[PDB]
């Protein structure tokens with residue numbers, strides 16, 4: 001392992017960006033029917049959890065490459081607007097269930113979710129994201145915005161943190 | 170011009186990243202005397218203005234490459250900690266003057282500022298950022314996190330917005 005604080009690298013930055021491009025093509029296709037436009041009708045990106053800023057920065061740039069204009073809001077007026085909620089990780093689904101339910105009260109045109117890392121085995125309630133960059137098993141990861149006690153967000157890859165790190169802390 | 174909404178491209182994403190690497194080397198050198206460490210003593214990145222999330226995402230990853238561990242806070246406990254305030258653009262300096270003065274009240278170990286775009290000719294008060302990625306003349310730019318009425322943040326380059334865009338709006 002190229003990092004002394006990690007036991008395994010699960011997804012490199014290159015692997016994540018390749019998958020993000022695949023997802024962006026699907027988003028571009030799915031929203032082509034919506035006549036999105038800068039200013040007049042952007043896709044509203046709602047970025048949720050502090051760590052999602054890395055994913056959000058990379059994803060909105062990729063979506064722009066694919067012709068999907070956005071505006072960004074951070075949770076860390078959508079009435080009649082299309083909303084895409086972005087989260088770096090989906091685990092119990094308790095965060096997204098609450099966010100999506102709250103945003104629904106403002107009656108957006110539609111609401112969908114995009115997550116960088118899904119941990120499908122972590123659910124405490126049923127929840128399926130419309131778009132998932134990558135799946136992880138039930139292990140604790142850091143990097144690509146994900147932290148351990150506010151550190152390691154800047155690791156370019158998604159990695160499994162060594163037990164020694166969090167015992168030596 | 171490669172964009173139909175811009176009259177000029179001022180800095181490409183590639184140009185910005187090259188300059189960010191030069192700045193990161195200076196930051197790494199300047200903070201080598203501080204014994205920064207994940208968890209125990211990270212550099213505290215305070216990211217200011219909604220648009221700074223793109224710059225912040227790219228910069229913390231570059232700083233990690235250069236061995237500078239960070240934690241991030243967004244303004245959009247530092248007592249005894251080193252703080253680096255990041256802003257996508259510095260113009261009148263009124264924002265950073267207030268932010269730096271407020272953070273000083275919590276007595277950090279030190280406080281410095283890093284901005285992606287400086288408009289040196291825009292000052293309403295004297296202010297010099299410790300680290301500047303790029304300088305722009307007194308023109309209104311979008312891209313690399315910078316918006317016009319919440320749109321165009323996702324443009325990968327820093328560009329001059331066409332007058333037609335903001336009259337046709």
Ligand SMILES: Nc1nc2c(ncn2C[C@@H](COCCP(=O)(O)O)OCCP(=O)(O)O)c(=O)[nH]1
Nearest residue numbers: 049050051090091092093094095140141146147
């Ligand atoms: N670093 C890291 N954080 C994890 C992980 N799983 C959940 N979390 C954190 C958990 C919340 O942590 C986000 C903390 P923030 O980025 O500092 O705001 O994700 C919640 C998703 P859920 O509501 O679907 O359960 C993981 O594997 N690694």
Ligand SMILES: Nc1nc2c(ncn2C[C@@H](COCCP(=O)(O)O)OCCP(=O)(O)O)c(=O)[nH]1
Nearest residue numbers: 218219220259260261262263264309310315316
């Ligand atoms: N898009 C864009 N915004 C500019 C520009 N100059 C100032 N601003 C906006 C201005 C504040 O806008 C940030 C808006 P946010 O990113 O939505 O929160 O920057 C203030 C810096 P100052 O306190 O030193 O004067 C510019 O050229 N382009």
